[PDB]
Amino acid sequence: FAGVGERTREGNDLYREMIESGVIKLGAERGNSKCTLVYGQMNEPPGARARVALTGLTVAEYFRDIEGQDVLLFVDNIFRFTQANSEVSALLGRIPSAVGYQPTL
Amino acid sequence: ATDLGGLQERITTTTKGSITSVQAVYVPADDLTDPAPATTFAHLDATTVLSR
Amino acid sequence: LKLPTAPLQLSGTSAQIATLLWQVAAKENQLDKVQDELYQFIELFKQHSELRRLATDPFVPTLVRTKIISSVLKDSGASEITKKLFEALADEGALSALLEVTVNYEELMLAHKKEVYCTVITAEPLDKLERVELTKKAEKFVDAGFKLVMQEKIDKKLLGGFVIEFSDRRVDMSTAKKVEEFNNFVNKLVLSI
Amino acid sequence: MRYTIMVSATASDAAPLQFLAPYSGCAMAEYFRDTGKHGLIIYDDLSKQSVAYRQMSLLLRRPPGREAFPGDVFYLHSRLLERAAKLSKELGGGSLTAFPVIETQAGDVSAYIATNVISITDGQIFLETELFYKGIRPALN
Amino acid sequence: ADAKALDELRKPKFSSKYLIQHVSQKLIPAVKEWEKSYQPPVIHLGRVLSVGDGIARVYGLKSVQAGELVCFDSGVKGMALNLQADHVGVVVFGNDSVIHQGDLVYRTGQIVNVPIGPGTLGRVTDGLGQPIDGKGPLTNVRSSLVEVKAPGIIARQSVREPLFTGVKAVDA
Amino acid sequence: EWEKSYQPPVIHLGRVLSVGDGIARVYGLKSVQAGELVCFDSGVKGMALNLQADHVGVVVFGNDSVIHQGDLVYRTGQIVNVPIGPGTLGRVTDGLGQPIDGKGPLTNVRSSLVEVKAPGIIARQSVREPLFTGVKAVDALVPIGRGQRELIIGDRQTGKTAVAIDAIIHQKNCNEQVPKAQRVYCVYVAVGQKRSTVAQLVKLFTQTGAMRYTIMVSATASDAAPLQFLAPYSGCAMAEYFRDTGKHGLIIYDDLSKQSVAYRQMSLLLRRPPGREAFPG
Amino acid sequence: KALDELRKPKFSSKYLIQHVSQKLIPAVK
Amino acid sequence: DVFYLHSRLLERAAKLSKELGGGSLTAFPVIETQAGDVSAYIATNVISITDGQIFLETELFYKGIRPALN
Amino acid sequence: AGYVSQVIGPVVDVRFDGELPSILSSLEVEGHSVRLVLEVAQHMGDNTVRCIAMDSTDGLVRGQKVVDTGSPIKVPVGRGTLGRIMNVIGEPVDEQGPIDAADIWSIHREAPEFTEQSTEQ
Amino acid sequence: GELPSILSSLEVEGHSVRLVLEVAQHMGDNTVRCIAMDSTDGLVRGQKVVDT
Amino acid sequence: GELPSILSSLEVEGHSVRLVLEVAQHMGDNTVRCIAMDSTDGLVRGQKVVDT
Ligand SMILES: Nc1ncnc2c1ncn2[C@@H]1O[C@H](COP(=O)(O)OP(=O)(O)OP(=O)(O)O)[C@@H](O)[C@H]1O
Ligand SMILES: [Mg+2]
């Protein structure tokens, strides 16, 4: 789970729901869990929210390329990935393209 | 907003005297969402919006 | 008016000052004199902090800077070219342009003498026959009567031969590169035939 | 005002004070959140805090975005509003709940600051102006 | 310019010294005869390079942190926002009419702090925490930073208790 | 014979002044041509775009993360060229003509420029012979001759690639029943597409047998914006080989609307003033 | 190395060449 | 200063006093809009400057109402 | 190794007197309230890179030592990351200790090549 | 030497009409930047400005 | 010396085609900025350009 720019309340709610439903286990039975959360919240700078989806991709690319699995990657709100890269493009002084997005959209 | 507030906050009734202020505001192309009339909406007690 | 033609053409606003300084100094035939004064000024800004304060500090007035540069440069063999140049660079706050005007003046002077600095990287130190047969091979990489200023180097990773470094272009006449491009060609053939 | 603090950076004040007043008020209310009590904070016209920060960024020659807002104008509101939290039992159980106020322009919530704070917060209280003169006060759509 | 031909000017290359020894005895009195038309050079202080519209560019201030409160010689507070290679652009917490080109800027070492605590309850402050209601300074109060980080994912619990607004529409 | 004919040529050097945003500033290269393909020391090529008075602006055909300040740029001596010829049929090449199908290098081929001025007024003639696409809606209602430009315009997922694919497959079907002088050798240019769809499309073209006549130029969505910008020109040069030697060619520039976005990216990163819908003039 | 302060020239004007040519051409005798 | 451009031009149309000769100057500035959009920059500038408006519509112009004064 | 030149919001220019880091490389900042990691965005020329920060740049002094790491942001991967919460730089946020890493992998990577794609839907 | 304060009024000598400038910002090279209360048509570079 | 006039045409020597420039501006340092009537692919920054 790559939560790109998630609210911290909804990220904590998803984490507790994953503990409760059993797909994430805590303590000594952590190895039997089924998900990996990668969390870049809204309170982080745009450089951090622009690369959380890449961190989720890296954790999934290990399971694809080494373990040889069929992985699920939940990029939560891909539009927030877009808007975080738009923000890091505006901070780097690049001229924004059409409606306000980065020229490298 | 800083220039408009620095002008506008001096037109006040204080504990010495009073200034009743009537300020006509040109609204460009009747667009009350334009920022130069929308900044001076919060600076007034009574707004008298004249409509076309 | 009637200034000499510059030996090679250059970029703007720090090299145009050098081209003008070169044309003025060749009109006065003091080309080696003002280069020496430019080097002495590089060392002058190296030595003292109060002198480079007149080039970096933005709070010194123009009057202080032009009067210090006028009063300290009254005499001592500094030409009228260099003294007027430092008045002109102190009047504008452009005393920081010295370090970039001397390198373009050096390139202009290194082009009026028809010379060329080079770097020969050889695997072993050269003999007085291993060198003489090299420069006649190295003089075909200049297009005129340019006399290269030999600069020798050592590098054991070359397996004999030489590499020229003209800072504009590089000729790799080595053997360690020749056995590199040999193996690439022989492996690009056996994958075809 | 036995329980109310007021941080008042008015319109006459300099734009860094209007930019900084929500962070001052939130650092005051985090005393109550962080020591087991409960907080409640209202940022009246957060759309004026964004205007003040736009003024400071455009005068600092920062690269503008749409409506000349800087790139870190989402980060500005998000790093303020995410401090409104419900702390866990080990951190005292305290809480801070925020009520940002955004003034829209004829209901256009597709404006930049309105979309930013709508995406940040946990829900809206819409107050349409057609319901207001219809007698419905509070004009909650 | 190029760098490969400019980094070799750190070496001396003159082979004649008829001007280095000439002005070295001549530099110091020529500097000293305009010493009162100088300003004292700043390293860890700052001097206002320019000012306008509530922004002061400040030469110097070699060790300001980003976001640190700086103070001018008029007592106006600033905040060093963008540290640049040659100056600091600070934002002025008040009128810049009392700030001139050449004024001294003093860093305070503090990122922007506010009065928090039980004593601020019932008080009317400005955006920096200082009281504007005119009933004395804030006592029973400690300072705290305004740019604290929000609590994390693990520092929260789920939002369960209701906060009553008292308005039927929102509470229903 | 390689040993007796071996002179290491005088390689003209250039430092990288500053790299980033897919455009490098290159000191030196004092004799480089405008539009010349240059080669960085990391292996990634580049086109000398803006010859300036003090530096050269090089757009980087690939990822600019492998280039540093102070890297050496070598000039190759000629304008941006792709290998054209009969050795390109069957091959899946990238935006610069380098094969990405993994079947070895392009042999039986010849380099040629990607930016050729189109043939003039007196070089054309009227479009007389038909090109059948095998789509009877098209071949009955919107008939297409040989030498025509036919826009396949539509929305997202309305069947544009399918019309292109059926034209390419129908060319394979007609090429077995016609003589040599009238055979259509197709090129598919996939700009800005997914690499998975280009892989499935190459599977389709080789399992129907149409890859014997097809060249496939793919600058996909992860490829750099100069490569998506240049890949239609590479494909058009590879098909101009068959145009210029008496044969007949078909070319599908699939999603030129993504080439224009790649060019908008390149122009807006060059600080060029945008126009309508932020596109350059 | 204190010469690194003078690395980049800080030009307060664009037409500096005209001012230095007004002062260096009269340096010719 | 494109408002000041037309402002300082159109304020010279004046009816002078009896002390200054009583002469007059009547300005008739002509602004062309684009598809009836009087909400443009220069159109709202000169509309805010001038006293009256003689607004001419295209839809009344092709209804035979000529001069097409709205 | 390198020292901070400009701190303009989340954008930090770092000056390296010797060898520059690559673009997309990670940079740790030495001496800070938290772990501040910069990621290189471009080379500005004059031996200076321009970085985007992964945390708050409040408290950053011009001349703070920035060390090159030689790689992009490397996060822990493996089955030991299952049920754990990582942030962008691979640090544990669920306060359950360290993250059991089979390997550390750079987050920046090219897409799988054309020979490596599968052609079956 | 001795730049005027911001918002201060300056009086330009030699102008036909009384031209009053108001200091808006300090530009930084011992230069203030002013807005003019009357028309600037007729100002010559170097013309003396007396601070009030 | 003796810069060409604006709108005067220039001939680039040693090109693949007849590259005719046409002077559009005077840039200021004996540099004229020209618009090329043909493709500039193949121009080197030393190429002799005669003035017609
Ligand atoms: N002639 C046809 N008959 C039946 N189905 C069709 C036909 N043409 C296309 N389709 C279906 O329509 C879908 C879209 O077709 P196609 O791939 O050509 O769209 P597209 O134009 O490439 O859209 P995009 O470019 O967004 O992928 C395909 O999945 C295909 O299965
Ligand atoms: Mg398609």
Side-chain angles (χ1 to χ4, degrees):
Chain A
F1 200 98
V4 189
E6 203 78 11
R7 302 168 173 85
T8 322
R9 181 193 58 87
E10 290 191 356
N12 174 79
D13 290 0
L14 177 77
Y15 173 59
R16 294 307 175 178
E17 262 157 39
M18 284 195 189
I19 291 173
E20 180 74 32
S21 43
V23 313
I24 283 176
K25 297 185 177 53
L26 307 193
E29 66 273 359
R30 182 216 51 88
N32 312 137
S33 70
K34 305 150 169 277
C35 203
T36 290
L37 312 179
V38 181
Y39 271 163
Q41 305 295 333
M42 269 173 189
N43 52 9
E44 293 187 358
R49 297 181 278 107
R51 315 257 164 256
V52 164
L54 304 188
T55 307
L57 260 178
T58 312
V59 183
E61 272 178 319
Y62 184 79
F63 292 136
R64 176 185 74 196
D65 289 355
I66 302 302
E67 320 283 312
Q69 303 184 176
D70 289 10
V71 198
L72 277 180
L73 172 72
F74 300 94
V75 181
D76 213 58
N77 217 354
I78 184 66
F79 169 70
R80 294 200 282 242
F81 168 79
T82 284
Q83 89 173 359
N85 279 81
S86 175
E87 284 154 27
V88 312
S89 199
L91 289 174
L92 289 169
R94 296 166 195 171
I95 292 178
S97 96
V99 192
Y101 302 105
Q102 61 269 41
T104 75
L105 169 65
Chain B
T2 312
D3 287 357
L4 188 47
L7 177 131
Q8 205 76 251
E9 284 298 282
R10 304 173 42 183
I11 318 169
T12 49
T13 295
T14 74
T15 76
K16 296 181 183 168
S18 91
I19 297 177
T20 297
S21 189
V22 172
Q23 305 182 42
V25 186
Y26 179 71
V27 176
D30 309 350
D31 190 12
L32 287 168
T33 70
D34 189 278
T39 308
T40 174
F41 259 109
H43 278 104
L44 311 168
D45 286 291
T47 68
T48 309
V49 175
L50 276 86
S51 169
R52 185 100 68 177
Chain C
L1 216 53
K2 282 136 44 194
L3 281 83
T5 77
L8 85 170
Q9 302 295 352
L10 271 187
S11 91
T13 189
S14 170
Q16 279 164 355
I17 306 176
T19 297
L20 180 73
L21 176 85
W22 189 92
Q23 288 181 304
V24 163
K27 199 60 184 186
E28 291 290 329
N29 296 90
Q30 323 190 31
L31 285 171
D32 307 77
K33 190 84 161 61
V34 299
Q35 185 164 0
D36 210 354
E37 280 149 11
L38 284 188
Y39 287 144
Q40 281 148 59
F41 268 109
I42 296 307
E43 200 63 43
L44 262 178
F45 282 105
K46 278 176 67 58
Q47 277 293 113
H48 322 272
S49 44
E50 291 90 49
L51 200 54
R52 88 179 83 94
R53 191 166 187 261
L54 312 182
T56 71
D57 198 68
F59 294 105
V60 286
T62 41
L63 185 50
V64 176
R65 162 175 45 244
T66 187
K67 272 196 300 182
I68 288 176
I69 289 302
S70 87
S71 89
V72 81
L73 256 54
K74 289 188 290 188
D75 62 309
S76 198
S79 172
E80 192 68 29
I81 306 176
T82 309
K83 281 154 52 184
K84 281 283 186 173
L85 160 75
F86 273 81
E87 288 278 48
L89 293 181
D91 272 8
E92 303 300 312
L95 272 172
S96 316
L98 177 75
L99 195 65
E100 211 159 306
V101 79
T102 68
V103 308
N104 297 271
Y105 190 63
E106 278 179 299
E107 179 195 36
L108 282 153
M109 283 301 299
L110 173 87
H112 174 62
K113 295 181 286 254
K114 293 179 179 179
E115 291 181 301
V116 165
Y117 271 68
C118 65
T119 296
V120 173
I121 299 192
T122 321
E124 279 307 322
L126 293 99
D127 319 279
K128 43 173 55 63
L129 181 46
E130 212 184 4
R131 189 182 300 117
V132 186
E133 282 202 353
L134 171 135
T135 78
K136 276 59 161 164
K137 282 206 81 43
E139 275 191 355
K140 74 203 209 63
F141 300 141
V142 304
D143 38 35
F146 285 100
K147 64 179 180 180
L148 62 80
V149 160
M150 294 300 293
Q151 186 173 355
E152 315 155 277
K153 277 289 186 170
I154 200 65
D155 195 329
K156 208 142 152 193
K157 307 208 69 59
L158 283 76
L159 289 201
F162 54 91
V163 189
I164 320 289
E165 291 263 24
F166 283 122
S167 76
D168 182 353
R169 52 219 200 276
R170 177 174 65 183
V171 186
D172 207 316
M173 268 281 305
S174 193
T175 295
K177 194 251 182 184
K178 182 186 172 64
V179 309
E180 180 206 300
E181 298 277 300
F182 177 82
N183 299 337
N184 294 17
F185 172 59
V186 78
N187 296 152
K188 282 189 301 178
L189 259 187
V190 299
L191 292 191
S192 89
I193 181 64
Chain D
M1 209 166 271
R2 270 198 62 235
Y3 307 107
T4 311
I5 322 174
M6 282 201 67
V7 177
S8 168
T10 69
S12 157
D13 285 16
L17 290 173
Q18 301 174 27
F19 144 77
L20 211 57
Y23 296 100
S24 317
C26 199
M28 286 173 201
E30 278 181 86
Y31 170 73
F32 305 112
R33 180 201 74 189
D34 286 326
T35 58
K37 271 80 69 177
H38 291 74
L40 165 69
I41 186 155
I42 291 96
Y43 314 103
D44 218 12
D45 283 328
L46 210 59
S47 81
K48 289 178 152 42
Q49 192 249 346
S50 57
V51 158
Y53 189 64
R54 169 176 63 183
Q55 166 181 336
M56 302 149 57
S57 277
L58 292 181
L59 291 167
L60 282 174
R61 295 301 188 87
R62 302 266 190 89
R66 35 176 298 194
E67 303 165 7
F69 283 111
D72 58 331
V73 74
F74 181 86
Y75 176 47
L76 188 75
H77 285 145
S78 78
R79 87 167 181 269
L80 163 75
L81 280 171
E82 286 296 323
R83 300 155 76 163
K86 168 58 175 171
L87 298 183
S88 70
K89 187 185 267 290
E90 45 265 14
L91 277 83
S95 83
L96 170 60
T97 166
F99 280 75
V101 171
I102 283 292
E103 170 182 310
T104 44
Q105 306 301 133
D108 194 27
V109 308
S110 39
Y112 194 35
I113 301 302
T115 49
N116 286 16
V117 190
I118 275 169
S119 78
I120 285 156
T121 59
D122 292 328
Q124 305 91 51
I125 294 175
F126 264 79
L127 291 161
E128 206 193 300
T129 188
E130 186 103 359
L131 292 174
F132 194 74
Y133 300 103
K134 216 179 302 188
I136 298 102
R137 295 186 182 181
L140 197 141
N141 184 17
Chain E
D2 45 352
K4 295 302 118 186
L6 188 49
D7 277 282
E8 58 191 35
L9 264 71
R10 312 195 290 122
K11 314 173 211 294
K13 276 150 69 170
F14 37 88
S15 276
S16 192
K17 295 180 290 294
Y18 58 93
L19 203 54
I20 310 172
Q21 68 205 15
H22 159 243
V23 296
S24 285
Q25 51 92 0
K26 220 172 186 58
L27 182 64
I28 31 151
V31 162
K32 197 263 179 182
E33 55 200 61
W34 295 282
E35 68 94 17
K36 279 322 295 181
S37 165
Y38 273 159
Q39 293 180 328
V42 290
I43 312 295
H44 295 140
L45 259 66
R47 197 168 304 272
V48 178
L49 197 57
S50 91
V51 63
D53 302 304
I55 304 279
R57 300 163 55 238
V58 174
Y59 178 79
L61 280 184
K62 212 184 68 62
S63 280
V64 280
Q65 312 166 258
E68 162 164 328
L69 275 166
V70 302
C71 187
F72 292 87
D73 48 355
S74 313
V76 189
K77 290 303 194 79
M79 176 182 178
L81 274 185
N82 52 342
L83 314 173
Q84 303 217 322
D86 45 316
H87 63 265
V88 188
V90 312
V91 291
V92 170
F93 289 175
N95 255 7
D96 51 321
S97 43
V98 288
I99 299 174
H100 319 85
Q101 181 254 331
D103 277 359
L104 279 177
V105 194
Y106 295 94
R107 54 177 300 237
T108 66
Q110 299 294 138
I111 312 175
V112 183
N113 300 121
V114 284
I116 81 163
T120 193
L121 207 59
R123 303 296 306 269
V124 190
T125 84
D126 65 336
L128 216 48
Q130 310 139 343
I132 68 168
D133 46 355
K135 44 172 68 173
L138 296 193
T139 188
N140 202 5
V141 150
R142 75 167 150 90
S143 94
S144 285
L145 294 99
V146 308
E147 297 286 342
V148 312
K149 202 198 163 60
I153 295 97
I154 212 69
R156 298 166 183 245
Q157 50 180 324
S158 277
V159 176
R160 295 288 191 257
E161 291 175 346
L163 177 131
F164 303 126
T165 298
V167 174
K168 293 181 294 187
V170 52
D171 281 5
Chain F
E1 60 163 14
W2 177 87
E3 260 285 359
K4 63 184 57 48
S5 88
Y6 173 76
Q7 283 191 7
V10 47
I11 296 182
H12 307 275
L13 260 185
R15 290 306 194 280
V16 171
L17 285 181
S18 59
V19 76
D21 304 343
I23 287 95
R25 307 289 184 87
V26 173
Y27 180 75
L29 303 186
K30 203 182 53 60
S31 182
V32 76
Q33 299 177 316
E36 154 158 350
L37 186 66
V38 302
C39 175
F40 289 82
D41 65 332
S42 300
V44 51
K45 307 297 168 185
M47 177 175 62
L49 190 69
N50 308 284
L51 265 48
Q52 305 262 4
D54 51 296
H55 63 265
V56 189
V58 175
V59 294
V60 176
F61 290 141
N63 191 29
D64 68 310
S65 68
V66 295
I67 315 190
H68 316 77
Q69 157 197 331
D71 283 333
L72 308 173
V73 185
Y74 317 108
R75 48 181 307 270
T76 64
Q78 50 196 358
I79 318 292
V80 174
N81 53 285
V82 286
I84 72 166
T88 44
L89 305 177
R91 313 299 312 266
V92 189
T93 62
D94 72 342
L96 265 167
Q98 309 172 351
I100 63 173
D101 50 350
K103 304 183 177 191
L106 303 195
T107 183
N108 204 42
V109 82
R110 160 174 56 100
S111 281
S112 154
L113 312 188
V114 304
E115 300 269 9
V116 168
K117 173 69 79 71
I121 296 282
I122 204 67
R124 317 297 185 93
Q125 68 176 331
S126 41
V127 176
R128 305 300 303 174
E129 44 189 353
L131 184 135
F132 310 123
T133 64
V135 191
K136 45 198 193 305
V138 169
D139 289 10
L141 302 175
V142 193
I144 294 158
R146 283 186 187 184
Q148 206 187 314
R149 290 89 47 91
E150 188 77 30
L151 181 69
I152 314 173
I153 178 165
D155 291 15
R156 171 184 41 87
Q157 313 177 227
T158 46
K160 307 165 291 198
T161 316
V163 181
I165 279 158
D166 298 359
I168 291 178
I169 293 175
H170 193 55
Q171 292 334 291
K172 196 267 305 187
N173 290 351
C174 308
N175 283 324
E176 301 150 347
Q177 315 160 11
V178 296
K180 195 185 72 65
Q182 34 174 350
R183 270 193 173 112
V184 190
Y185 304 100
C186 317
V187 185
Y188 190 90
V189 188
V191 176
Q193 300 195 21
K194 302 198 288 181
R195 198 172 284 174
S196 66
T197 74
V198 185
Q200 296 148 22
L201 183 50
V202 161
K203 181 188 73 65
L204 167 77
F205 284 152
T206 184
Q207 94 180 349
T208 192
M211 191 51 82
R212 186 189 149 185
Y213 310 98
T214 316
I215 317 160
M216 167 84 56
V217 190
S218 92
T220 50
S222 41
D223 272 5
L227 277 184
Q228 311 182 30
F229 152 76
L230 198 80
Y233 298 101
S234 304
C236 191
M238 292 172 185
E240 264 182 342
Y241 172 67
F242 304 106
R243 188 204 67 192
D244 284 324
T245 65
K247 277 164 271 284
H248 305 289
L250 187 71
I251 181 147
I252 288 93
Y253 316 105
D254 203 278
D255 259 345
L256 288 186
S257 46
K258 299 183 172 183
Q259 193 211 14
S260 65
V261 177
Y263 190 51
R264 161 166 85 187
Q265 173 179 341
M266 284 179 50
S267 313
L268 288 175
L269 292 181
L270 284 163
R271 318 283 309 188
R272 285 178 177 178
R276 177 177 288 271
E277 310 185 28
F279 279 110
Chain G
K1 187 62 65 194
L3 205 53
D4 268 29
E5 323 188 1
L6 310 184
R7 191 62 61 100
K8 196 65 179 177
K10 276 191 73 43
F11 291 142
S12 61
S13 88
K14 187 193 190 61
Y15 309 105
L16 159 67
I17 301 97
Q18 269 73 36
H19 184 88
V20 299
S21 63
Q22 197 183 4
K23 295 259 167 188
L24 273 192
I25 303 183
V28 164
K29 205 57 50 176
Chain H
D1 43 11
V2 81
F3 169 75
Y4 175 55
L5 177 74
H6 296 143
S7 169
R8 79 182 186 263
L9 169 78
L10 290 176
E11 287 269 321
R12 299 155 68 157
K15 175 64 160 84
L16 295 184
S17 65
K18 293 308 173 191
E19 268 87 327
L20 274 82
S24 91
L25 189 56
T26 320
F28 272 62
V30 177
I31 284 291
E32 164 178 318
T33 50
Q34 293 302 136
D37 178 63
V38 309
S39 301
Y41 192 22
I42 304 300
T44 61
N45 278 342
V46 191
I47 276 171
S48 44
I49 290 158
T50 60
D51 312 282
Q53 277 98 40
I54 299 177
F55 187 58
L56 306 160
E57 294 250 353
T58 311
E59 63 180 358
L60 319 177
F61 189 78
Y62 292 115
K63 280 174 201 169
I65 305 181
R66 285 180 293 273
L69 186 135
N70 196 352
Chain I
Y3 53 94
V4 183
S5 200
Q6 313 181 357
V7 189
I8 305 174
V11 166
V12 169
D13 299 345
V14 189
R15 199 175 190 93
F16 288 86
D17 52 356
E19 190 90 17
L20 289 204
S22 58
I23 295 182
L24 310 168
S25 158
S26 192
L27 292 187
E28 304 265 1
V29 181
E30 289 314 316
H32 203 262
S33 158
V34 283
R35 182 190 164 183
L36 180 54
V37 157
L38 318 172
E39 167 172 306
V40 183
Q42 45 189 305
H43 290 182
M44 304 304 291
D46 293 20
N47 275 95
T48 296
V49 306
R50 176 174 290 235
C51 302
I52 187 78
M54 299 289 144
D55 211 316
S56 195
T57 47
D58 292 349
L60 215 56
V61 186
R62 317 206 292 280
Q64 275 207 22
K65 186 180 184 171
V66 165
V67 293
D68 199 346
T69 53
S71 202
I73 294 181
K74 296 181 85 69
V75 298
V77 298
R79 285 162 189 260
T81 75
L82 289 179
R84 303 300 309 268
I85 299 178
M86 313 164 40
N87 55 352
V88 44
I89 62 176
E91 280 193 318
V93 196
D94 53 329
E95 62 178 46
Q96 293 205 356
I99 286 172
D100 184 30
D103 215 2
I104 46 173
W105 276 22
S106 92
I107 64 175
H108 287 96
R109 196 164 289 108
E110 298 282 339
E113 313 104 304
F114 191 81
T115 70
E116 287 301 285
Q117 292 289 329
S118 92
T119 63
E120 292 93 6
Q121 306 190 25
Chain J
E2 190 67 30
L3 261 62
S5 298
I6 307 180
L7 311 171
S8 77
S9 170
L10 317 182
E11 296 268 357
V12 192
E13 316 287 334
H15 212 85
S16 51
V17 72
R18 180 188 171 203
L19 176 61
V20 168
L21 312 177
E22 158 168 324
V23 183
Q25 56 203 42
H26 288 185
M27 284 303 301
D29 292 337
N30 288 131
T31 293
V32 307
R33 183 180 293 239
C34 303
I35 47 176
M37 298 304 138
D38 206 356
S39 189
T40 45
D41 270 17
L43 273 185
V44 188
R45 290 172 303 182
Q47 182 174 358
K48 273 305 156 185
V49 165
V50 171
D51 180 28
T52 48
Chain K
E2 194 189 299
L3 270 77
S5 313
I6 308 186
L7 310 180
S8 89
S9 44
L10 316 184
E11 294 275 330
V12 179
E13 261 85 45
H15 208 57
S16 318
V17 279
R18 186 185 165 194
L19 176 62
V20 178
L21 314 175
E22 171 206 289
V23 181
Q25 281 173 357
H26 272 217
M27 284 315 289
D29 271 329
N30 298 268
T31 310
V32 289
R33 176 159 283 170
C34 316
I35 317 166
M37 298 303 119
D38 214 350
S39 66
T40 53
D41 287 24
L43 271 190
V44 188
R45 282 173 294 174
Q47 284 220 16
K48 299 316 283 184
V49 182
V50 83
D51 173 32
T52 86

